[PDB]
Amino acid sequence: LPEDPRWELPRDRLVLGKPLGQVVLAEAINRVTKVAVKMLKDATEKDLSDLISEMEMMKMIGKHKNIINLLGACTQDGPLYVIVEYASKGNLREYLQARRPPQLSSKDLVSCAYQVARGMEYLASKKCIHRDLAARNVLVTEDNVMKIADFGLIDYYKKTTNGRLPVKWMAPEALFDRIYTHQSDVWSFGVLLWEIFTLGGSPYPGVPVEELFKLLKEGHRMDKPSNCTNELYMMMRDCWHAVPSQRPTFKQLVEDLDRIVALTS
């Protein structure tokens, strides 16, 4: 694999450590920085294709506070190691669930939403469409900064590691017509807001795929969470507009969340 001196880190500068979920925690060196490293598990060439793709797409997208940023790579004379920012508190779902009462203020929760919307606006400005935006693909740093993940990356019945179905984040036009746009991502954003305000709640509990389809076709919409203002619930519903052109954009969402954060206790 060809050397990219913008990014290449010598192998002897990386101290591999504990597994994270093939993603390990590591130390890049006179000061050490904790980072996350991805590597290939016996794997296909495709798997190597996919890995390199993820890395190159990160090269192009650029730096933002609210996304997992590439930090380097080990490409010469060994397996490929992609090195990125480490977020010590795991995904947004786990972070949220672990701070359920028997803590996060109202303002904290709104602040999370604002940050994810910021990350998404940037990715959008860079022409990137996520296709699986969800609390589980948002990671949280030690400083509680939201960072979007898996933006550089179907069986509708495959469940996640935690027993939930991804189709439940998917806008209708993407689900039935496989048409994906920034506006389908905005739909998924609306679902992710629901997760924030139900402190890591699971959407449509007990609803399998086929019944899911029935609900969407009938125009069903999730109930308002208990820890939710009408304004924030309207924001969700606007995200779930039947007609994609009539959904807000992440630009709009960022501006509205900025104002709300400010006025939230």
Location of structure tokens 């929760």? 109
Out of 4, 50, 108, 132, the active site residue is 132
Q: Which of 76, 77, 87 is nearest to 35 (CA)?
A: 87
User: Is 199 labeled as ligand-binding?
Assistant: no
* Site track for ligand 2M2 across 36-55, x = CB under 6 A: x-x---------------x-
At its nearest, how many Å lie between ligand 2M2 and the CB of residue 52? Answer: 11
Q: Give the bridge partners for 146, in sequence order.
A: 140
In this chain, which stretch among 20-28, 113-121, 190-198, 211-219 interacts with ligand 2M2, using CB under 6 A?
Answer: 20-28
Residue 253 touches ligand 2M2, criterion: CB under 6 A: no
Binding positions for ligand 2M2, 96-155, rule CB under 6 A: 137, 139, 149-150
Which of 67, 87, 212, 232 forms a contact with ligand 2M2 (CB under 6 A)?
87
Pairing type for strands 81-85 and 70-74 reads antiparallel
Cβ-based neighbour number of residue 176 at 10 Å: 12
Amino acid at 17: G
State the Cα angle at 87 between 197 and 248, rounded to 5°: 40
Label each residue of 230-251 as H, E or C. HHHHHHHHHHCCCCHHHCCCHH
Residue 241 touches ligand 2M2, criterion: CB under 6 A: no
Residue 84 touches ligand 2M2, criterion: CB under 6 A: yes
Is residue 132 part of the annotated active site? The answer reads yes
Residue 23 touches ligand 2M2, criterion: CB under 6 A: yes
User: Most distant CA pair in the chain: distance in Å?
Assistant: 61
Q: Are 188 and 130 in contact (CB under 8 A)?
A: yes
Which of 2, 21, 163, 205 forms a contact with ligand 2M2 (CB under 6 A)?
21
Q: Which helix (H) or strand (E) holds 94?
A: helix 92-98
* Radius of gyration for the alpha carbons in the chain, expressed in angstroms and rounded: 19
Residue 68 touches ligand 2M2, criterion: CB under 6 A: yes
The binding site for ATP consists of 20-21, 38, 85-87, 91, 136, 150
Catalytic machinery residues: 132
Annotated binding site: 20-21, 38, 85-87, 91, 136, 150
Residues binding ligand 2M2 (CB under 6 A): 20-21, 23, 36, 38, 54, 68, 82, 84-87, 90-91, 137, 139, 149-150
